Curated annotation (Swiss-Prot), chain B:
Induction: Expressed very early after infection. Encloses the DNA at 45 mpi. It is found in: Host cytoplasm. The chain holds residues 48 to 95 of 631 of the full protein. This is Chimallin. Transmembrane segments: none annotated. It comes from Pseudomonas phage 201phi2-1 (Pseudomonas chlororaphis phage 201phi2-1). Self-assembles to form a proteinaceous shell that encloses the viral DNA and compartmentalizes proteins and DNA during viral infection. This micrometer-scale compartment contains narrow pores and is the site of viral replication, with the proteins involved in DNA replication localized inside. Provides a surface for docking of capsids during packaging. Probably protects the viral genome against host defenses. Homotetramer. The tetrameric protomers further assemble as a square grid. Belongs to the Phikzvirus chimallin family.
Length: 554, 48
């Protein structure tokens, strides 16, 4: 501060940020190359948001495209946060009390908390002043941070794809604000004698983001257009017949019952929702159409398919035999055996797993679909609860005609529910390749800790204890990951888990089914499952003291 | 398909094969080098 101005030794040290200028140069070169190859149009601008001369936590890159609507300028911005590992932000301190002693907890600050209302206000004012329009309206298009520990010198493809996707998002938000024809399933008939088919898939390698961020995905549900006519030409050649893709994985939760209902309940978590690669448009009405595919995974209990053991290898991280540790027998059920097969795998699932699953979503305010995750988070609960629900109902009505009131009543029925759970987002480098941090779940922790139930119970309480403070839960979760996974964990963000309403999913599915949507797709005896429906409730009908005392009332 | 032509957002994504043009360029350069060193004769053509 004033010490440097008080002594004034010749020469300058530090006092600069070097992960912004290089990124700006790279982005300018990429934009020039893309414009040269007739890939984009010279109608957008790239600007730098320096932290030094704006006094903000993190520098950012903003991509602004402006149009004119009825004489009123409109500017759309897609900020890109640029976290740096060379500087440390001050931590947040919290105090908790235990008996007669008080202590201080040093938390950590994520990217999400940096992007506050004041940050966006300063960014909008800076953009308005730079572009020469002081009173122009500014609309957000969805932030997307660039993860640290990424070398920009050899990552040109990811940056190029991110820039094109950002331009597409700006165009999408501008078109939505201007007002265009909504996307409806009535226009999907094609009037050419084709049908829509849904294909389920079981995967073992994680999916990848546009910047190489791994995403856990065990079950993948896709929707395609099947146009197989009689003498179909183009053998072995396919014309982009694919529309949607949803990545899902199942997790087990244990209900608190002391020891006929199964002890464990299976909950399915939706991680990523996206459209086809060929489709360059993203509109709100496609999101619900893509999300409707999640419910179709229960057609043949396909959510349990990843649980069955694979033949030849055993990673011992997702083993299902650990479920027997707390069963009636203390030991674990031994898979990988000649006798073990699907014959009693179904018996085990019937006797220890509830038949019906639970649907959950990992909403993220900083992901690719931030503009919908934020809306759903607002609809879950807060000051803006009625407006978000009304907007969602209006969008669902716009997709597929109307008359959604016959199946759902948003006035007296919650849409989304918040479970009060915060999930870290990170990646750990396995021996073979980089993986996702969310691979560690209840089953993984149970496998890691063979017989010590108390440690596992402590881990389980470290996730959803309502009494314990959230900072302590985050500390315990960060310690357990280090204990089990390894030393290569690198956190990147935060996410929140929410539970959909049970009736909402069924109502949405029935509404889409009734709206003219038709989707087609795809042993030892155990007993009579239909004899129990017919049972006599009544009993055969055949003809076949009380001493009292004085009462003043009567 | 018709969805892209129905909305028409600016910018282009995918829709190309990049393991053919580079191979063709490499083969043309190799053919030119071979012809220069008096290894072959300029009587054949390379097509994609």
């Amino acid at each position: 501060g004033g010490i440097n101005s008080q002594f004034t030794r010749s020469g300058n040290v530090q006092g600069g940020d070097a992960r912004a200028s290089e990124a700006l140069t790279v982005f300018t070169r990429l934009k020039e190359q893309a414009v040269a190859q007739q890939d984009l149009a010279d109608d957008f601008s790239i600007l730098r948001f320096d932290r030094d001369q704006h006094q903000v936590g993190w520098s950012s890159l903003v991509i602004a495209k402006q149009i004119s609507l009825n004489g009123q300028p409109v500017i759309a911005v897609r900020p890109l946060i640029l976290p740096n590992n060379s500087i440390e932000l001050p931590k947040r301190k919290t105090n908790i009390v235990n008996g007669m002693q008080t202590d201080v907890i040093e938390s950590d600050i994520d990217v999400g908390t940096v992007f506050s209302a004041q940050y966006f206000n300063r960014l909008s004012t800076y953009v308005q002043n730079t572009l020469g329009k002081p009173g122009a309206k500014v609309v957000l298009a969805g932030p997307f941070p660039i993860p640290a520990d990424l070398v920009l010198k050899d990552s040109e493809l990811q940056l190029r794809n991110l820039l094109i996707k950002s331009v597409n998002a700006c165009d999408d938000i501008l078109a939505l604000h201007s007002g265009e024809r909504p996307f409806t399933i009535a226009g999907l008939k094609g009037q050419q004698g084709e049908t829509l088919a849904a294909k389920v898939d079981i995967r073992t390698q994680p999916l990848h983001d546009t910047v190489g961020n791994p995403i856990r995905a065990d079950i993948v549900v896709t929707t395609q257009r099947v146009r197989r006519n009689g003498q179909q030409e183009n053998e072995f050649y396919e014309t982009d017949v694919k529309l949607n893709q949803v990545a899902m994985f199942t997790n087990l939760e244990r209900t608190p019952q002391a020891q006929t209902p199964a002890p464990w309940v299976a909950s399915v978590v939706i991680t990523d929702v996206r459209n086809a690669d060929g489709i360059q448009a993203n509109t709100p009405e496609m999101y619900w159409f893509a999300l409707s595919n999640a419910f179709r995974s229960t057609h043949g209990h396909a959510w349990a398919r990843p649980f069955l053991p694979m033949t030849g290898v055993a990673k011992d991280m997702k083993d299902i035999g650990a479920l027997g540790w707390m069963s009636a027998l203390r030991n674990r059920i031994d898979t990988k055996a000649a006798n073990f097969d699907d014959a009693q795998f179904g018996q085990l699932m019937l006797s220890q797993v509830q038949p019906n699953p639970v649907f959950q979503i990992d909403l993220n305010r900083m992901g690719e679909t931030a503009q919908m995750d934020s809306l759903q988070l607002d609809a879950a609960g807060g000051p803006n609860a009625q407006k978000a629900a009304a907007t969602i109902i209006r969008q669902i009505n716009n997709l597929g005609g109307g008359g959604f009131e016959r199946f759902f009543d948003h006035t007296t029925q919650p849409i989304l529910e918040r479970t009060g759970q915060v999930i870290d987002l990170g990646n750990w480098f396995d021996g073979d390749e980089k993986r996702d941090r969310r691979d560690l779940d209840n089953l993984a922790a149970l496998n890691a800790a063979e017989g010590n139930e108390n440690e596992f119970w402590g881990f389980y309480g470290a996730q959803l204890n309502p009494n314990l403070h959230p900072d302590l839960r985050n500390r315990q979760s960060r310690n357990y990951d280090r204990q089990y996974l390894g030393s290569t964990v690198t956190y990147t963000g935060k996410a929140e888990r929410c539970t959909y309403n049970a009736k909402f999913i069924e109502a949405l599915d029935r509404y889409l089914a009734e709206a003219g949507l038709q989707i087609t797709m795809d042993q030892r005896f155990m007993g009579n499952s239909v004899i129990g429906n017919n049972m006599v409730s009544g009993q055969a009908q055949v003809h076949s003291q009380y001493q009292t005392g004085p009462s003043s009332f009567y």
